[PDB]
Structure 1
Amino acid sequence: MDYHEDDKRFRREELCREAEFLKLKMPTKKVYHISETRGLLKTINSVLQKITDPIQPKVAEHRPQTTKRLSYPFSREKQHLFDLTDRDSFFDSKTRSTIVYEILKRTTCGITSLLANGVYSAAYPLHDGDYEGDNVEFNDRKLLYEEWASYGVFYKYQPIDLVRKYFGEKVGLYFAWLGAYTQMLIPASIVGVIVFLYGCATVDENIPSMEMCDQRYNITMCPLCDKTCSYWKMSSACATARASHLFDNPATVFFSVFMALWAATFMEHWKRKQMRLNYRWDLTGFEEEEEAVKDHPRAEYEARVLEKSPAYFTNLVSIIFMIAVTFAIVLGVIIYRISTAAALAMNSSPSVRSNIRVTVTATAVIINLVVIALLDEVYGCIARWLTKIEVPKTEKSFEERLTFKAFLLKFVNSYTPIFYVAFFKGRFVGRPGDYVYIFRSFRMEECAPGGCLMELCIQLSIIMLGKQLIQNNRKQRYEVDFNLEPFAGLTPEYMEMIIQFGFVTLFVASFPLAPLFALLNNIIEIRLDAKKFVTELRRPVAIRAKDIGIWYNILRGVGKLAVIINAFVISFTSDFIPRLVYLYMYSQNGTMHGFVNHTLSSFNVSDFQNGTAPNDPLDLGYEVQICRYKDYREPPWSEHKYDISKDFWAVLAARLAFVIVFQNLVMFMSDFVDWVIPDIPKDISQQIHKEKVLMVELFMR
């Protein structure tokens, strides 16, 4: 058991005597305010730190931390900058460790500089008691483990005031944002399941899927590979189109519009919720500028430049970063290409007889996720080094610059395969007359029969489900806390949820139940992070924070990019604008009977390109006279044959017109939602006005 100390530091028991002097210079400056009690162990010794009530309100008034009054309006205890009450335990251990860390950070030799120097191994506050203990007397860590961090309490709300009071406003704000996100993902998931079930209802009776799954037509297609494979009927690969109707029905456009409205509504809902929490925790915004101490490399840089005495390297850093982002785009493209070219020769040596082309795609996206998870650490280390060579002035700007660089690298190498599949997958391959060969050897890529919307959708499925299946498959208190994992930070746990929000808002236009997978991951993730923070981590030092920070701007930017990416998905990969163009220009019946016959373009088989015909052209049981590819081109019985016809330009013009009207109308709807939903809630504004007039009443009397 510990006695009632607040912070705790770790020595290194045994340059060496220079290190001992660098130690002893610090607490001899600390006894000016804070007591000490050096602990004892077997190999490496440790030291304690008890605050004194002489110095407690001195620092508690040095920075105004709004503590509770004695008078209360309408059963709610009012709060003021510093207050007076007996029973000297009204400073909880969170605030006590915050004060002692303020003294540890202000007292020079702060503590972070010598901690990076390596004279102290660790400096951490103490966990209140221990969870699952034998008759522990109302422990806050135990109460949080029982009511918040268990897995069988996933349905319940989370005690956000108690997790704030125990872990600090930063951890409380992360869990409040995660709770608001998982709560806003409920109507998203409901409408997504409704849309998917409507697709399942109309699969059996939509016409352009019956046109593909209908036999007795015998539509012979072109091989879509150079020399290995051969011709194939459109009647065979029709389960792909039958399942693609689930993902490109006319309700998924409604779900795209609804998801942009949902993203704007969630932005406003979290803004109002964090204003409410800033009311409930710290109404005052006295976190002023130029109070944070500069970096030690910043101090060395300014001392060196004033000694030997800067306007070009500060932008050369960003130039290097933009070159790295472009290289990361190209590297993600080629890593996905060699990933889908790695899972090959599946039928010769194993001969498992898949005959679904879903096993090979799942293997491709799984090993692509493996290589991306390997490159994540490299990109993070590169961003850290690339900020450390810039040496920013303050720690806030250092964290924000490192966060933005690591987010751009994670964004790029996480959404590059999906952007590649969704947009630039099978466009720039030519007709069967002349294919576009890259590096003169082999054709570029033709995406899977029935469209590569299905490839995109099962890629999103395997990503949003594999990020869950990879995990699913008597001692003293100070040394017990030493044996835990040090608290790294909230930046990767912010980053994973921002990447998931990007997945949802960017590709609901093709995957209408991405909010369902995100909600089923977040329900587990809230309790997993809760169990981690309670059991496996040292106590975070609990620094105050007003909002999330740069992550809200990142969220708003991803929500802005979601509109244009959804527009481009619905137009250029959903096969939804060709159906409207058929129905409203080339119908002659009012219905889309013959849409597949209008989409597929004929091809005289004798016009190949230097023996690129399949070596066995008899696989369908007959010699083929005309294969039918899919490119909106002129027939071979024409004056201008195989060139682009009028229908390609008509469909393309309608696609771009839909991008224009979708982007404009949906961005205006998002701006209108953000403008109608008010920034300041009525209850919070009325309560702060009432509290301020009651405070000036109390100070006038």
Structure 2
Amino acid sequence: NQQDFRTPEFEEFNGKPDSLFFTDGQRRIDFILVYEDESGTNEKQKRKRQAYESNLICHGLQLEATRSVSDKLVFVKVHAPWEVLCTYAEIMHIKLPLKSFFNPATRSRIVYFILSRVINRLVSSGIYKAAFPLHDCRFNYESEDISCPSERYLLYREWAHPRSIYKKQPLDLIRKYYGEKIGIYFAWLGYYTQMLLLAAVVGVACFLYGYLDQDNCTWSKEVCDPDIGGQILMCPQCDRLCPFWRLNITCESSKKLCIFDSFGTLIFAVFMGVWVTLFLEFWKRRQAELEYEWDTVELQTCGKCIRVTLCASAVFFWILLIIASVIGIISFIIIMILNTIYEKVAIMITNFELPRTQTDYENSLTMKMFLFQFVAYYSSCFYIAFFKGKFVGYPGDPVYLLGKYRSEECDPGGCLLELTTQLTIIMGGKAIWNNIQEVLLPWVMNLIGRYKRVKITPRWEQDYHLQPMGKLGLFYEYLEMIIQFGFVTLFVASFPLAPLLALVNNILEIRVDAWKLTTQFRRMVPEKAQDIGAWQPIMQGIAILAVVTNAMIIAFTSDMIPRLVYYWSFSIPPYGDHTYYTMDGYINNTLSVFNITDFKNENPYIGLGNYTLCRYRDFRNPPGHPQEYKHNIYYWHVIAAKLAFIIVMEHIIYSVKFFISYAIPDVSKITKSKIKREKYLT
């Protein structure tokens, strides 16, 4: 309990390149602790380190320290004796199969438990440079020792290298080598990829149906018509800087809009609601299956309430700040710095809210960081969907909020097409660059570390010369995948190829994550986690919000409801001039005229052009009406249809989700049978 002596067996030997055992070779290496002490502060750190090392030795562990061949840095190898392993396996209730005994991953986990109970505080307080486990060997080369398997080499050769992209994930193998946390993360990623493949095939079918019915959408032909679409002069969008422009320049946008906006897309939106429900339920089943297989289950005011609401206000205070930043912007290098900016501020809030428990801190930081990223990523999409062009008024008296003038109307192509373009960008290009940066940054850091020259190097030095995966390693990966899932599900009513883009991205993502974790990053201590954690409630909330968001997208930001309404009610004799239902004349009977009579509350139109009547895209009465520029029966019918569609789709989808969740058992039948059999035989 005091600094009686130092670490025994203090000898230096680095001749064996891959000696995961001690100098004697009898016992392997469970951990390595890196420090530097040969050169007030120095002597105090020496005293504290010697005291802690004496405590560790007195507790029963076997440690010995060797200085680096390449001086002032010393590594201590750590191995737990058989008796210590047995007693702490009895303490920590590990499920060994009773019919080299302990797998190296769980050996390292137990040793880390010992270090925590008697480590991170010293590491944080400049005492120990590092503390880590060791890999089998170099990933691309076999282990020199034959007794010790090169499980890492096999994992890299058949699962981590890109040449093994198509091969199935050795999930049991990666669980064994890395730990239950990484295992369940990759299992969830693979199951997500499978369900993405299913939904992407269905969405491709719907997209191709719309593609086949390309020249059968009459409004696009009317758009591309040099007469019907050429004699339509849409009013200028901005004051004195935008010109009166004809709809002819929107024919390509019209074709893409026929592809992206059709009853096929509506069917895919409904199917995507159903598929989200199925995804959640079958992930529950698969997670229960993994709980059975991997034995994931293990065990080990008023003043505060004012403080609770104190930070929540600050959290809400910062959220609206980053809202305006994106809106004013409407940028990758700023985004990455934004995250550590988010990290720093979320740390501060957690600091004032810390119950000092690691899991509680994780939950709080998860919620805060997810809110920050959610806003920073989906603010532009939400604006384009719901707030862009909806509050504009009309050419007479356009809505001026303040000295800031002329809240923008929609683009010539359409708000839905712009949203689809933004989704495609953030989905493909920025995700690809995220993967490229994610795979290059650790490799570049390792390259510069080697270039600093900091010949055969032993295993501890080899692993030390690597980037240490810091706190909350898999958290960023989960955040990335959850953002991708939010893009897939929240906005799937825009274009149906989002699951296909996510499918390609995930096929690359599994390989890039595995490759970087295997090669570029120092190995972490294996842990256990029966579920993905707070990400499960986050996904459930995203799923619930997805129904509302998709229904609102279809009703408000998509013109499908106005087109359906025109077909079913404004082609009949009382409103239309056709004997039966049709869609011709849709543009001429939906676009609203406007004579040039502007309030003097400037008149940019006279300076912009020499015309008299321009046709803007809203549903008001035409000029000359007894209540001109006012809303009309057609506008109120369209708004009624939008609201009714929202209500009907919301209620039907929610009831279907309830029925599916009720009629699909949470736990698989085979899982029940195997659990019952093992309980019977055990």
**Aligned with 1:312: secondary structure?**
helix
Query: How much does 1:614 deviate?
Result: 5.4
Q: Does 1:477 align with 2:459?
A: yes
Evaluate the alpha carbon distance shift between residue 614 and residue 464 of structure 1 in structure 2; reply closer, same or farther with a 3 A threshold: farther
1:641 match: secondary structure: coil
CA RMSD of aligned residues (A): 1.8
Alpha-carbon distance between aligned partners in 2 of 1:17 and 1:555, rounded to the nearest angstrom? 52
Answer yes or no: is the 8 Å Cα contact 1:7–1:123 preserved in 2. yes
Whether 1:43 aligns to 2:68 is: no
**Matches of 2:571 and 2:333, distance apart in 1:** 48
CA deviations 1:446-498 (Å, max 9, x no partner) are 11113211111100001101223325592110111101111231101000000
CA contact (8 A) 2:136 2:143 kept: no
Match of 1:204 among 202, 215, 220: 215
- Provide the C-alpha distance between the structure 2 equivalents of 1:469 and 1:5, rounded to a whole number of angstroms: 39
**Conservation of the 8 A alpha-carbon contact between 1:453 and 1:573:** yes
Query: Following TM superposition, by how much is the alpha carbon of 1:33 offset from its aligned partner in structure 2, in angstroms?
Result: 1.3
Q: Is 1:7 paired with 2:42?
A: no
2:531 to 534, 544, 547: 547
Q: Distance in 2 between matches of 1:254 and 1:556?
A: 22
2-structure distance, mates of 1:174, 1:135: 28
What CA deviation, in whole Å up to 9, does each residue of 1:159-188 have, x standing for no partner?
010101000000101111111101111111
Shift of 1:606: 4.6
| Alignment match, 1:425 | 388
**Deviation string for 1:13-39 (max 9, x for gaps)?**
222111011101112111121011111
- In structure 2, C-alpha distance between the alignment counterparts of 1:458 and 1:660, rounded to whole Å: 28
Match of 1:501 among 485, 488, 499: 485
Cα drift, residue 335 of structure 1: 2.6
Contact 1:228 1:614 (C-alpha < 8 Å) held by counterparts: no
Aligned-pair CA distance for 1:444: 0.9
Q: Residues of 2 paired with 1:186 and 1:149: CA distance? A: 21
Whole-Å Cα distance in 1 between the matches of residues 152 and 436 of structure 2?
A: 26
Asked if structure 1 preserves the Cα contact closer than 8 Å seen for 2:224 and 2:248, the reply is: yes
Comparing 413-422 and 321-330, the one that deviates more? 321-330
Q: Give the CA deviation at 1:269.
A: 1.4
Counterparts of 1:612 and 1:371 in 2: how far apart (Å)?
Answer: 37
Rate the CA distance shift 1:472–1:66 in 2: closer, same or farther, 3 A.
Answer: closer
Q: Is the 8 A contact 2:140 2:153 kept in 1?
A: yes
2:347 equivalent in structure 1: 384
Separation in structure 2 between the aligned mates of residue 555 and residue 679 of structure 1, nearest angstrom: 17
The C-alpha deviation readout for 1:656-679, integer Å capped at 9, x for no partner, is 111111111111112222222211
Determine the C-alpha separation between the residues in 1 that align with 2:335 and 2:581.
48
Shift of 1:334: 2.3
For the pair 1:326 / 2:320, whether they are aligned, the reply is: yes
Cα pair 2:397 2:598 within 8 Å, conserved = no
Find the partner of 1:275 among 285, 288, 303.
288
- Equivalent residue runs for 1:234-633 within 5 Å: 234-282=247-295, 285-288=297-300, 310-336=304-330, 367=331, 369-470=332-433, 471-472=435-436, 474-488=456-470, 489-588=473-572, 589-607=580-598, 609=600, 610-613=602-605, 615-617=607-609, 623-633=610-620
Q: CA deviation at 1:311?
A: 4.2
Does 2:101 match 1:90?
Answer: yes
- TM-score when normalising by structure 1: 0.86
TM-score scaled to structure 2, two decimals? 0.88
CA gap 1:438/1:537 in 2 versus in 1, 3 angstroms: same
Q: CA deviation at 1:225?
A: 1.8
Q: Distance in 2 between matches of 1:660 and 1:328?
A: 32
Percent identity (aligned): 41
Which whole-Å CA distance do the structure 2 matches of 1:24 and 1:443 have between them? 71
C-alpha contact 1:432 1:608 (8 A) present in aligned 2: no
Who is 1:355 aligned against? none
In 2, are the aligned partners of 1:230 and 1:614 still within 8 Å (CA)? no
Name 1:67's counterpart in structure 2: 96
Match of 1:226 in 2: 239
**1:235 to 1:463, Cα distance in 2 relative to 1, 3 A:** same
Would the aligned equivalents of 1:9 and 1:48 in 2 still touch at CA under 8 Å? yes
Gaps spanning 5+ residues in structure 2: where? Answer: 1-17, 22-27, 438-455, 573-579
Secondary structure, counterpart of 1:49 in structure 2: strand
Aligned to 1:580, the other structure's residue is in SS state helix
What's the secondary structure of 2:162's corresponding residue? coil
SS in 2 for 1:10: strand
Query: Contact 2:240 / 2:608 at 8 angstroms: preserved in 1?
Result: no
Distance 2:77 2:157 in 1: 29
Deviations 1:612-658 (A, max 9, x none): 115352xxxxx533110011111112221111111111111110111
Taking structure 1 as reference, are residues 438 and 264 closer, same or farther at Cα in structure 2, changes over 3 Å only? Answer: same
CA distance in 1, matches of 2:67, 2:323: 54
Aligned residues of 1:226 and 1:614 also touching (Cα < 8 A): no
Correspondence for 1:641: 628
| Separation in 1, partners of 2:513, 2:598 | 62
Alignment of 1:166-185 (within 5 A): 166-185=177-196
Partners of 2:137 and 2:143 within 8 A in 1: no
The 3 A distance-change label for structure 1 pair 311 and 587 is closer
**Separation in structure 2 between the aligned mates of residue 564 and residue 124 of structure 1, nearest angstrom:** 47
- Counterpart of 1:142, as a letter, is Y
| Whole-Å separation in 2 of the counterparts to 1:269 and 1:153 | 27
